[PDB]
């Protein structure tokens, strides 16, 4: 009972968790529940690999399932970690199963950081182990036959799968054993042996000789093709080649022998003899040439008896001419076997440790989408603010709308009064003064954090250097200096930001001292404010004039244009679409994810009404500014230039400008403060890293 089986590949143990957990934490919340399960999966995973590949080799279905499970799990991980770029480097080291090499030596090894390589080797071991479990089965027993058939077919499919994937899975050339041609040959050997098992079942079940001859002939055809492949390319262990040659002949003989019984039953006595002679010749050759590998004594006796009996009857009774072999018809062929497809899960009762984990492809698309969503939202918002800023600057330069509200040059025009009261309510000048005052204190807070952080590093390093200098033998560690270069690289960037923040401060400060006085005036109680605003004569051309009403409507509309910008900006910021589903659908429905066309399409649907309206604001303002510009210069002819009115106009213009300045200043300062406050949160984290690292030392 000699069946071919394949030996398991050897691999060196590697740390599975490490590069996995490293990535895990990089991509999730510290202490966050992710780690809680994911890191616990990557742990159980490494133990699996060791169990599936480190263990001494056990021909136990339990041991085979563990290997199958490991192939399943390993496959289930590919989408959920960024192996492709390979910045994620975990290296897999396997040895050739057969100690085969293109160059002359004993054994050839190969370490690759390609999960594709790992996958092929695991599957190979799955195939090889299955082939060993099959070769051990008791074939005089129905269960043994079922088990042997199933495993040989599994092995056949696994090997063939390896053949079809191996090269795409690998950058460089494979070790021989898993090379496409080696695994193609093994695949066919496994299939032949499965066909053999069905021939034995057929025999044991005493099926018709017609069937048995066809099953056996199909086996012959399988073993014969495998033989041919091996005939000029010796990449399998030494006993494989002779065994194939033997099994090819034995299966041919079986086919002849059963076909001869059929001939006999049809009174084709000459054919019967010719076929039994072919069978005797085949089995005779096997007995002497491959006795090292097979035992055909019982079969040889059986043939011999059938031939002697047949020659007797023919020589005395039938007198039938014995045909030449070339004149006989082919025995047909019937296959009952198929290479089993590898579709994970190939293990029983599988459960993907990382099923919850989100496919890398989708996160790459979610991140991408957000860089697009930010750009859309920020862009439109900035477009709107710059436009509003531009128009306020234009209206002030024209004394609008003050000029139209100033019917009596005696009193504070209503729009100035509204603005005054608005500012006073917002705290007045105190508001600005306070923000300005503590700007330098927020800077100082941050410098201090940064400085203390770097001092930690400096101090420890200082003792590290001393210790190495005095205790060379006893103090041998990577020098703190080396270890700290990364954190000090952060340090220098932080420092670069702070240098810029200082400049941003100096700019806002200078701009604040350049407008403080006029803002102080704006904030006076109304009578005191009126008293400081030079009076002038009015002109009745104010009451009912056309230019005034035209200008007023233009101004009212422009006002509606800028008040609308508030709701638009807020609607821009308050909405969002979670794109996870859209990406997962694309990925399950399809093989790949193209976010660009997807992002664009969803963005357009979520933000398109708004982005459109924003664009209308801008063009609408444009129209308005040209119109008021022309209408004013006309309104200008109407009014009269004297030093009194000139002086009033200068103060009104300056008062409107002071309102806009107060608005901008408060906003630029609160943006400054937020920056310093957020920078403190980051510097506090940075300071912890420095503490941690100085104390792990």
């Amino acid at each position: 009972a000699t069946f071919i089986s394949v030996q398991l590949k050897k691999t060196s143990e590697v740390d599975l968790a490490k590069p996995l957990v490293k990535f895990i934490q990089q991509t999730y919340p510290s202490g966050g529940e992710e780690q809680a399960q994911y890191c616990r999966a990557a742990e159980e995973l490494s133990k699996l690999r060791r169990a599936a590949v480190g263990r001494p080799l056990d021909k136990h279905e339990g041991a085979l399932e563990t290997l199958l499970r490991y192939y399943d799990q390993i496959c289930s991980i590919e989408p959920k970690f960024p192996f492709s770029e390979n910045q994620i480097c975990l290296t897999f080291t396997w040895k050739d199963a057969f100690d085969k090499g293109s160059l002359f030596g004993g054994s050839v090894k190969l370490a690759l950081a390609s999960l594709g390589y790992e996958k092929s080797c695991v599957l190979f071991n799955c195939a090889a182990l299955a082939s060993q479990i099959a070769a051990e089965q008791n074939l005089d027993n129905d269960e043994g036959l079922k088990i042997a058939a199933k495993h040989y077919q599994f092995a056949s499919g696994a090997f063939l799968h390896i053949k079809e994937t191996v090269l795409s899975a690998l950058s460089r050339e494979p070790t021989v054993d898993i090379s496409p041609d080696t695994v193609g040959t093994l695949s066919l050997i496994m299939l032949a042996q499965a066909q053999e098992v069905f021939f034995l079942k057929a025999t044991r079940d005493k099926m018709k000789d017609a069937i048995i001859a066809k099953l056996a002939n199909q086996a012959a055809d399988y073993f014969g093709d495998a033989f041919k492949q091996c005939q000029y390319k010796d990449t399998l262990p030494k006993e494989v080649f002779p065994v194939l040659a033997a099994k090819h002949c034995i299966m041919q003989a079986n086919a002849e022998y059963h076909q001869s019984i059929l001939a006999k039953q049809q009174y084709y006595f000459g054919e019967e003899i010719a076929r039994l002679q072919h069978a005797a010749e085949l089995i005779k050759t096997v007995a002497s040439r491959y006795d090292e590998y097979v035992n055909v004594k019982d079969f040889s006796d059986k043939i011999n008896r059938a031939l002697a009996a047949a020659k007797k009857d023919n020589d005395f009774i039938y007198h039938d001419r014995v045909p030449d072999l070339k004149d006989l018809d082919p025995i047909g062929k019937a296959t009952l076997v198929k290479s089993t497809p590898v579709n994970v899960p190939i293990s029983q009762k599988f459960t993907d440790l990382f099923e919850k984990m989100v496919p890398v492809s989708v996160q790459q698309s979610l991140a991408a989408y957000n860089q697009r969503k930010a750009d859309l939202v920020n862009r439109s918002i900035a477009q709107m603010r710059e436009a509003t800023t531009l128009a306020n600057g234009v209206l002030a330069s024209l004394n609008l709308p003050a000029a139209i509200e100033d019917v009596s040059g005696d009193t504070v025009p209503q729009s100035i009064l509204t603005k005054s009261r608005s500012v006073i309510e917002q705290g007045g000048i105190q508001t600005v003064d306070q923000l300005i005052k503590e700007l330098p204190e927020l800077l100082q807070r941050n410098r201090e954090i940064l400085d203390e952080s770097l001092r930690l590093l400096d101090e420890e390093e200082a003792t590290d250097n001393d210790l190495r200098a005095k205790f060379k033998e006893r103090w041998q560690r990577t020098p703190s200096n080396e270890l700290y270069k990364p954190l000090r690289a952060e340090g220098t960037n932080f420092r670069t930001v702070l240098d810029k923040a200082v400049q941003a401060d100096g700019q806002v400060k200078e701009c604040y001292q350049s407008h403080r006085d006029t803002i102080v005036l704006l904030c006076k109680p109304e009578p005191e404010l009126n008293a400081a605003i030079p009076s002038a004569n009015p002109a009745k051309t104010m009451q009912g004039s056309e230019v005034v009403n035209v200008l007023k409507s233009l101004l009212s509309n422009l006002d509606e244009v800028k008040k609308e910008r508030e709701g638009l900006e807020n609607d821009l910021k308050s909405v969002n679409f979670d794109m996870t589903s859209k990406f997962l659908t694309a990925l399950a429905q399809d093989g790949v994810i193209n976010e660009e066309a997807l992002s664009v399409t969803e963005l357009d649907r979520v933000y398109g009404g708004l982005t459109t309206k924003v664009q209308e604001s801008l063009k609408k303002q444009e129209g308005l500014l040209k119109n008021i510009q022309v209408s004013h210069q006309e309104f200008s002819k109407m009014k009269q230039s004297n030093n009194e009115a000139n002086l009033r106009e200068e103060v009104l213009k300056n008062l409107a400008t002071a309102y806009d300045n107060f608005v901008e200043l408060v906003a630029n300062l609160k943006e400054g403060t937020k920056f310093y406050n957020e920078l403190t949160e980051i510097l506090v984290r940075f300071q912890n890293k420095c503490s941690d690292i100085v104390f792990a030392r």
Binding site: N493, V497, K500, A501, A504, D505, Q507, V508, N668, E671, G672, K674, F675, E678, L679, E681, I682
Partner: peptide, 15 residues
């Protein structure tokens, strides 16, 4: 053009 624009951008980059 806003004094803290660039500095605010540098911050996100890191945070």
């Amino acid at each position: 053009e806003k004094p803290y624009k660039e500095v605010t951008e540098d911050l996100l980059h890191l945070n």
